[PDB]
Design a protein around this ligand. Structure first.
Ligand SMILES: OC[C@H]1O[C@@H]2OC[C@H]3O[C@H](O[C@@H]4[C@@H](O)[C@@H](OC[C@H]5O[C@H](O[C@H]([C@H]2O)[C@@H]1O)[C@H](O)[C@@H](O)[C@@H]5O)O[C@H](CO)[C@H]4O)[C@H](O)[C@@H](O)[C@@H]3O
Length: 730
């Protein structure tokens, strides 16, 4: 059996073994053609039927190490899985056509098996595309930066697939946006794209993101700005004056129509005007309760009531208060709906209520309602982890199988082109069902299964993890969208669904997510995702928060000092904990590690113990005291942010764009209007230099006044992070 799928698995940055590459073939350029077999073959040929010539290509076996198998298993971050996947990718054949003729054709494959059988594939269309300057569609765009004769349309006999066009950029202009970015604040000089993807660690090195947007601000060195938003949830690409030094080249997927209309919203004025313009279209941050601004405690290996409470007691006994505990390993690890070890009756996959459950005294959670009641009594809110997938593994218990069947039977699942349920193509929870959160009925069906957690157990919010799982431009959603538009939108609908649940139960919409797109602004809180415990990851995380803030993602946090691998070195923890104190959401977290030694918790005491630096507990006391003192400031500035549209974690160009020097210090940022923050991001530093912009500035720790428009240098013991306050009028 020969398998060929023209578009492949549709991982956004990788090719499967069985596809055309490029997936939309282009006349004049090379075309690589791949196929796989279900049993070993000695030979495969590709027959390509042009009208004037039939041609036969002898294909050659693909070495899996040279395929994208490693990337399809999640990349370098999942090294063991990636390596074995490369070895396993051993049934692929490949040929390539160096300069593809501009003529339509059909093609098929023929193989000879080792036992001597000939096998033949179905026939496939080949309709090559070319770039045309004819006005095949219309770009609808105002302003004076559009280049009128730049549009080119990628057309084939089957239709129009992509468009590219250019915008003028001037010599002094800087480009900030495209959502959360991990590499640099100023995107000028780079090529990038906007597509929701899970890059598991090293997001900066790979130049990818969980939370893109097809939007950016362009700011000159006189203080003036303009901005553009491509009004699409399809993929877009940007060459931000990398190839042509005074041109932003934009490329837009037109998706799975004859004369398309591409709308580009534009704004100009101050930097704050431009961002407000975008938020009036995209959505605005929501009002949140004050308790989001205390310390959040988290750790994946806190998987019993006793383990969570032990840590909460430890926080009290050390004088390091927490406002929020995130519990990730709470459920049966099958349905993410029921606490581990809970006993109950089967009910055909219907929504449970609290009285359905009995909790054994020797089980993982002997009284989770008592835990939540008691935590609330101590001033601590409780957040439970979630994923927008339903596992279908053959080893699942009766309840998880019933839940999945009920999901399917409801209709509220994302579907393949052929109407059957989408089976997750990713490396995380492979083959799982994916609920359709694209309509109200779909969102309610999924969230109703969880309602009792809010109404009966009284939890305060959800860590709405994942959301990047939909691959396939021709998937089907109940709102009428296909995958080409729906897949990037998915994380927005997902956070929205859980916000709606919380709100309908008398709570605030506290969802905590990693992925998003245009519209995510209006749905909860966000964290920077998964990273190692390195200095490079610290610097990249600061850039993530500032750039996220520059696209309206206001309630941003990160896993301070990294969550993955060995605990951070003591100095990184110290510098990162200090930095996190001056960011919108302050949170520590640690990855699953099979409950093995050494303990991986990012608690101040575990890190102190393993690094031999007892002083880290004292430092955490100190900075958490500072955090508490900062709470009315964060509340008041958050209010002003909702009114003005300025970020809370705020790039310097929002208040001082007329100062060209700000761009040489892209990891300094304002926290609200009054405080200038400069994290210490190198090991061994005993002094640290900060560029103060125009005005008078007061040292947060010493009271020392400094004149602005200058660099200043500050001694930086671990009990100090450079923070300067504006000196206002009398
Ligand atoms: O890149 C995919 C994925 O890799 C890691 O998870 C793989 C792991 O998933 C399942 O077990 C999970 C367990 O890992 C843990 O996940 C919570 C974790 O999710 C994200 O990180 C994961 C990796 O851990 C990543 O997306 C997120 O970034 C991070 O902040 C979170 O801590 O806990 C849940 C709940 O207990 C558990 O289901 C799966 O069972 C396992 O086989 C697989 O190896």
């Amino acid at each position: 059996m020969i398998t060929h799928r023209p578009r492949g698995i549709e991982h956004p940055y990788a090719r499967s073994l069985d596809q055309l590459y490029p997936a939309i073939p282009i006349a004049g350029q090379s075309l690589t053609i791949g196929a796989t077999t279900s049993g070993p073959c000695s030979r495969m040929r590709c027959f390509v039927l042009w009208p004037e010539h039939e041609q036969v290509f002898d294909m050659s076996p693909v070495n899996g190490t040279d395929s994208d198998a490693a990337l399809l298993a999640g990349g370098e971050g999942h090294l063991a899985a990636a390596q074995q996947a490369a070895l396993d990718a051993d049934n692929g054949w490949q040929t390539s056509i160096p300069h593809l003729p501009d003529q339509d054709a059909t093609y098929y494959f023929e193989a000879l098996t080792l036992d001597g059988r000939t096998e033949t594939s179905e026939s496939f269309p080949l309709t090559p595309s070319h770039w045309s300057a004819e006005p095949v569609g219309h770009i609808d765009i105002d302003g004076d930066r559009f280049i009128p004769d730049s549009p080119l349309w990628l057309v084939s006999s089957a239709g129009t697939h992509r468009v590219k066009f250019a915008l003028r950029i001037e010599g002094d202009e800087h480009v900030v946006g495209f959502g959360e970015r991990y590499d640099q604040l100023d995107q000028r000089g780079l090529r990038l794209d906007s597509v929701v993807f899970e890059q598991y660690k090293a997001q900066g090195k790979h130049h990818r993101t969980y939370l893109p947007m097809p939007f950016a601000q362009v700011v000159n060195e006189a203080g003036r700005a303009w901005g553009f938003h491509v009004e699409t949830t399809r993929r877009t690409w940007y060459d931000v004056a990398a190839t042509v030094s005074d041109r932003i080249l934009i490329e837009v997927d037109l998706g799975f129509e004859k004369t398309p209309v591409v709308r580009v919203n534009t704004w100009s004025g101050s930097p704050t005007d431009v961002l407000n313009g975008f938020l009036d279209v995209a959505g605005r941050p929501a009002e949140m309760p004050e308790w989001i601004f205390g310390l959040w405690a988290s750790g994946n290996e806190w998987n019993t009531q006793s383990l969570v409470m032990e840590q909460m007691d430890r926080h009290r006994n050390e004088g390091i208060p927490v406002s929020v505990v995130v519990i990730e390993a709470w459920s049966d690890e099958e349905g993410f709906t029921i606490f581990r070890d809970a006993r109950y009756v089967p009910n055909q996959g219907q929504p449970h209520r609290g009285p359905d459950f009995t909790y054994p005294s020797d089980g993982a959670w002997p009284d989770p309602a008592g835990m939540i009641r008691e935590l609330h009594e101590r001033g601590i809110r409780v957040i439970l982890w979630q994923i927008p997938l339903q596992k279908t593994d053959d080893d699942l218990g009766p309840e998880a199988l019933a839940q999945g069947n009920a999901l399917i039977a409801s209709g509220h699942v994302v579907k393949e082109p052929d109407g059957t349920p989408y089976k997750n193509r990713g490396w995380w929870f492979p083959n799982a069902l994916m609920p359709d959160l694209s309509t109200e009925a779909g969102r309610q069906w999924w969230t109703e299964q969880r309602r009792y957690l809010v109404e009966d157990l009284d939890i305060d919010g959800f860590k709405t993890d994942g959301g990047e799982h939909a691959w396939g431009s021709d998937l089907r959603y109940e709102d009428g969208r296909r995958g080409d538009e729906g897949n990037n939108l998915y994380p927005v609908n997902y956070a929205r669904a859980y916000g709606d649940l919380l709100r309908s139960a008398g709570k605030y919409p506290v969802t905590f997510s990693r992925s998003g797109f245009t519209g995510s602004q209006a749905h909860g809180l966000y964290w920077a995702g998964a990273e190692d415990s390195t200095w490079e990851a610290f610097r990249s995380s600061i850039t993530a928060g500032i750039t996220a803030g520059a696209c309206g993602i206001l309630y941003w946090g990160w896993d301070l000092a990294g969550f993955s691998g060995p605990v951070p070195e003591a100095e990184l923890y110290a510098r990162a904990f200090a930095a996190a104190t001056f960011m919108p959401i302050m949170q520590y977290h640690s990855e699953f590690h099979h409950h093995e030694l050494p303990l991986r918790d990012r608690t101040p005491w575990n890190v102190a113990e393993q690094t031999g630096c007892g002083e880290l507990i004292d430092l955490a006391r100190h900075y958490t005291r500072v955090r508490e003192a900062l709470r009315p400031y964060l509340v008041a500035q958050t209010r002003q942010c909702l009114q003005t549209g300025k970020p809370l974690m705020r790039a310097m160009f929002y208040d001082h764009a007329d100062d060209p020097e700000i761009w040489a210090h892209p990891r300094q940022y304002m926290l609200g209007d009054e405080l200038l923050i400069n994290p210490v991001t190198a090991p061994g530093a005993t002094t640290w230099t900060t560029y103060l912009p125009e005005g008078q500035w007061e040292d947060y720790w010493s009271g020392e006044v400094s004149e602005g428009g200058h660099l200043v240098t500050r001694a930086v013991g671990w009990d100090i992070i450079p923070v300067y306050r504006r000196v206002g009028a009398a």
